[PDB]
Design a protein around this ligand. Structure first.
Ligand SMILES: COC(=O)[C@@H]1NCCc2cc(O)ccc21
Ligand SMILES: COC(=O)[C@@H]1NCCc2cc(O)ccc21
Lengths: 237, 300
């Protein structure tokens, strides 16, 4: 059924599973028209489909042309997400297909269930975890590929860089969610924490900086402090 | 006008005939029901006084044979049987009619209620939902499960209603996922009407039979079928105008007849609120909406 903190280790077992987050599929800027009405302008978006055990990220870039002449875009976006996740599953070899797909938002359940009727043995599940995957577009290299896209495109990343050489999947996911939560809460300060040190760099083939084990402990502590600091500012604590 | 005689009434029981009902005491000299209107199916139903768990009954048409009821003390129920000897049936009926041991089907002349509830219900279609081919009448009870219920257990005792499932490959054309899920017209018109039922009359007959079973026997599976068949029409953007107008009439009389005190267990709030206020057909069921709002405003 629903996925929560009681069954959290299930994410790192040997049953292939994917998280699907649709919060960056349909992205708009709101602006005034010449006549003083309000209009939206879409910008390119993306589906965030992540294997939390391996770090493999299937980033489907949603180019603004998919919305052209369509109505009810917020509704259509859920169905387009479902269509694309279904197409990804069909594209994978059988032994790579997931046994479970966990959607971050419950509004994705029916669209994905309906698109996956041909896969009755793939469980479609909600989660009670609040996961910060909306902040994926704060990762510079992910935002860059989305905004430069001129057509629909799938790009594959490992969102853990090379961390699984040194840490477990459970720990890698915890580091990822901490980084994304910090970027969601205060993007400027999070990026300052990650990139201000001039002796630390991001490898061409990575998303995050090349921190040593001890440097990651310091970074993780700084990210926790940021989150707590922002919580205090928010609630006046 | 036809007659269903009773050998005896050895156990105290509430007997229903269509929408009417009456109480018979243990060993009372009750010998059946006369003046049953020819031209309609009928249902004769039972709930034992000493065990209300016993709710069951028989659908029948007096045009298809002569039927009588006798208590079976081994199986503990009133059983319908068919009489093949016509002259005997008439002599036994006349004898009891002369001694005034029968209740009269109490139809008021102005009253079209039963016709309105059974307009599309035919015995031949009943006998395909309820499979017991050796009898011309059909037994139904409170606990019988539907085929769809059994997929989610004895198949011979099942209600073979047409399976309706909005999240099934039958309902959703590959490549038309959003279209077919948000607008069920394909499923209603091509799959169900043109494909399975052949016409709206058969669809409405099953809808009406499901409602009657749910209301007379307190059968849960029937109630799920009745609501599903309503929701399928209401959730379709393209429905023939004659079907919408006829559905409004069908539901009006169903809601009118439902016992007020059973509304909590016979009406699904989600389905009715969706159908009356959110669906494509939210403005197409004026008579049903008006009676629902005046009679069961709490549900809404
Ligand atoms: C002498 O038998 C009976 O009176 C018996 N109970 C009345 C009802 C009935 C009807 C029938 O067609 C055949 C038998 C019966
Ligand atoms: C139409 O179904 C029924 O009448 C069924 N009879 C048993 C009691 C019962 C209770 C409920 O809360 C809901 C349904 C039922």
């Amino acid at each position: 059924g629903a996925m929560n903190s009681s069954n959290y280790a299930e994410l790192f077992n040997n049953d292939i599973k994917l998280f699907v987050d649709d919060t960056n599929v349909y992205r708009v800027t709101v602006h005034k028209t010449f006549e003083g009405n309000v209009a939206t302008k879409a910008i390119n978006g993306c589906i965030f489909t992540l294997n939390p055990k391996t770090g493999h990220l299937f980033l489907k870039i949603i180019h603004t042309s998919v919305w052209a002449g369509q109505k009810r875009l917020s509704q259509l976006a859920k169905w387009k997400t479902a269509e694309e996740v279904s197409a990804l599953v069909r594209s994978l070899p059988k032994e790579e297909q997931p046994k479970q797909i966990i959607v971050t938002r419950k509004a994705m359940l029916d669209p994905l269930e309906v698109h996956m009727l041909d896969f009755p043995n793939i469980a479609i599940r909600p989660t009670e975890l609040r996961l910060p995957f909306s902040a994926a577009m704060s990762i510079d290299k992910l935002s860059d590929v989305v905004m430069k896209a001129t057509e629909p495109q799938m790009v594959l990343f490992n969102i853990y860089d090379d961390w699984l050489d040194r840490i477990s999947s459970y720990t890698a996911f915890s580091r990822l969610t901490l980084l994304l939560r910090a970027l969601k809460t205060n993007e400027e300060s999070a990026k300052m924490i990650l990139l201000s040190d001039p002796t630390i760099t991001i490898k061409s083939y990575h998303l995050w900086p090349s921190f040593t084990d001890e440097q990651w402990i310091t970074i993780e502590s700084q990210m926790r402090d940021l989150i707590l600091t922002e919580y205090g500012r928010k609630y006046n604590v | 006008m036809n007659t269903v005689p009773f050998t005896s009434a050895p156990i105290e029981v509430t007997i229903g005939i269509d929408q009417y009902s009456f109480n018979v005491k243990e060993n009372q000299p009750f010998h059946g029901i006369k003046d049953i209107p020819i031209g309609h199916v009928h249902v004769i139903h039972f709930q034992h006084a000493d065990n209300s768990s016993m709710r069951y009954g028989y659908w029948f048409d007096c045009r298809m044979g002569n039927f009588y009821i006798q208590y079976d003390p081994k199986d503990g129920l009133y059983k319908m049987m068919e009489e093949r000897d016509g002259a005997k049936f008439e002599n036994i009926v006349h004898n009891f009619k002369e001694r005034q041991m029968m209740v009269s089907y109490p139809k008021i002349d102005e009253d079209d209620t039963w016709y309105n509830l059974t307009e599309f219900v035919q015995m031949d279609k009943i006998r395909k939902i309820v499979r017991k081919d050796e009898n011309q009448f059909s037994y139904v009870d409170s606990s019988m499960t539907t085929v769809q219920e059994n997929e989610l257990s004895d198949p011979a005792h099942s209600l073979n209603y047409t399976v309706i499932n909005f999240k099934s490959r039958e309902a959703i054309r590959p490549g038309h996922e959003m279209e077919d899920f948000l607008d069920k017209s394909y499923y209603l018109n091509t799959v169900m009407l043109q494909g399975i039922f052949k016409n709206s009359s058969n669809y409405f007959g099953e809808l009406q039979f499901a409602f009657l079973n749910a209301m007379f026997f307190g059968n849960y599976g029937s109630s799920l079928q009745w609501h599903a068949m309503i929701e399928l029409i209401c959730s379709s953007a393209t429905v023939p105008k004659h079907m919408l107008d006829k559905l409004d009439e069908i539901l009006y009389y169903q809601i009118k007849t439902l016992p007020e005190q059973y509304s909590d267990i016979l009406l699904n709030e989600r389905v009715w609120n969706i159908c009356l206020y959110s669906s494509f057909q939210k403005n197409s069921l004026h008579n049903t909406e008006k009676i629902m709002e005046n009679k069961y405003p709490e549900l809404l």
